[PDB]
Amino acid sequence: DSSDLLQREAILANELNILDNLKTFLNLIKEVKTNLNILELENCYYSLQSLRKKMRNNAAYLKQSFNFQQSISTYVDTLHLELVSTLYKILTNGFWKITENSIQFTPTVEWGKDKVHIEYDTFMDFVAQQYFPKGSLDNQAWFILDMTSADSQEQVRAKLNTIMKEYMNLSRIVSMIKNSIFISGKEISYENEKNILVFSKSCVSTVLTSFEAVCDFMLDGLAFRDRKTLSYELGPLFNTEFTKFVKNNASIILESLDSPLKNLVSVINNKLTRLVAKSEVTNWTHSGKEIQDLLMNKQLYYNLLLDKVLESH
């Protein structure tokens, strides 16, 4: 009974220490949650940074009984998922909306009930820094690594992985464009007002006009970031396939001196040239000389005919 009395006095002696400790944790969690509600999502990451610092450093923390301690560490986990999920929704469904035959981009959004202004470059600046600072996804980073619930961690990875794969490396956009340009019966269109690139199903004119849609979208539809990424990835192919197509349809494009397909071919040519300059890449070039010449000099048409004939002659 004096042991019961002792224990009771031990417990009470540690009470104010426990509540003070709890009070701190709640203040740090309040921080995370405040920032998340007011969509200060850059800050919110640093709020989680301090919190995971304090949790890593509290030696009492891991000594708390299983279920109680686990429930706090899981709460904070789902704040990890909440911040990333909010990031992913603003990105994959605010700045970008990519259906299976549309690609839409907007450099600005007014998000949530309180309608807060967010700018794509500012946003993508901190997102890159915090989650992909090496240029790829940091799988050894505390954000992923400190999480202690399997399902919420898998989900955080998945979301961050696709943000890299599809909204940084633009992989799906790159393949949608790749699978349509210069392919007969695959139409593409560009509505500059709503800034959407629409893929359809449906001649030499239609192919050129739809490749011009792609061009216009990259020239005028994108942030510097993504024009550069797509141009890096597609530029080589743009080059090979524009000219191959023009040469293959010479007799319809070049057979007359002032054929109306020449205006369109000219325009796409100067646009491809503006693209290289504008995207600032170095993996491909486009002076546009070869096409300017071909369109201007009838003899070059005759040369193609001559050349083609001599292959199987």
| CATH code for the domain of 55 | 1.10.287.3290
Q: Is the CB of residue 264 less than 8 Å from the CB of residue 208?
A: yes
Last residue of a domain, which of 65, 91, 108?
65
Contacting residues for 169 by C-beta, under 8 A, at least 6 apart: 229
Looking at the structure, tell me whether residues 71 and 58 fall in a common domain.
Answer: no
Helices (H), 58-191: 66-90, 120-131, 142-145, 150-167, 171-178
Nearest to 211 by CA among 256, 251, 243: 243
The residue written with tokens 């640093």 in the block is 46
Buried b / exposed e over 201-235, threshold 16 CB at 10 Å, is eeebeebbebbbbbbebbbebbeeebbbbbbbbbb
Give the CATH number, domain containing residue 160.
1.20.58.2230
> How many angstroms separate the CA atoms of 228 and 233, rounded?
9
- Same-domain status, 49 and 102: no
Number of domains in the chain: 2
Same domain for 180 and 61, yes or no, is: no
Same-domain check for residues 37 and 90: no
Task: Name beta bridge partners: 71.
Answer: none
Q: CA 122 → CA 36, 91, 138, 223, distances in Å? A: 17, 12, 21, 11
Give the residue from 14, 48, 65 where a domain finishes: 65
The identity of residue 181, as a single letter, is I
Burial call 7-21: b when 16+ CB within 10 Å, e when fewer: eeeeeeeeeeeeeee
- Does one domain contain both 164 and 259? yes
Contact 228, 279 (CB under 8 A): yes
Polymer length of the chain: 313
> CB neighbours (10 Å) of residue 238?
25
Q: What is the distance between the alpha carbons of residues 178 and 180, in angstroms, rounded to a whole number? A: 6
Give, in degrees to the nearest 5, the angle at Cα 150 between 171 and 81: 60
Last residue of a domain, one of 14, 47, 65: 65
Which H/E stretch holds residue 18? Answer: helix 2-37
| Cα(109)–Cα(240) distance, integer angstroms | 37
Element (H, E) at 108: strand 108-111
Residue-number span of the structural domain to which 6 is assigned:
1-65
- The experimental method is X-ray
| Same-domain check for residues 257 and 151 | yes
Give CA separation, 196 vs 103, 202, 220, 274, in Å.
6, 19, 11, 21
Backbone φ and ψ of 198, nearest 5°:
-105, 130
- Count CB neighbours of 99 within 10 A: 10
148: nearest Cα among 218, 66, 36: 66
> Pick from 194, 2, 228: which is nearest to 97 by CA?
194
Do 90 and 219 lie in a common domain? yes
Contact 153, 159 (CB under 8 A): no
Does 128 lie in the same domain as 31? no
- Indicate whether 61 and 72 sit together in one domain: no
Same structural domain, 61 and 128: no
Q: Same domain, yes or no, for 171 and 216?
A: yes
SS3 201: strand
Assess whether 228 and 240 both reside in one domain. yes
At what resolution in Å was this solved? 2.4
Tell me the HSE value of 23 on the side-chain side, using a 13 A CA sphere. 6
Distance CA 120, CA 109 (A): 8
- Structure-block tokens of residue 192: 């500059």
Query: How far out from the chain centre does Cα 94 lie?
Result: 12
Bridge partners, residue 111, by sequence: 116
Phi, psi of 311 (to 5 degrees): -65, -50
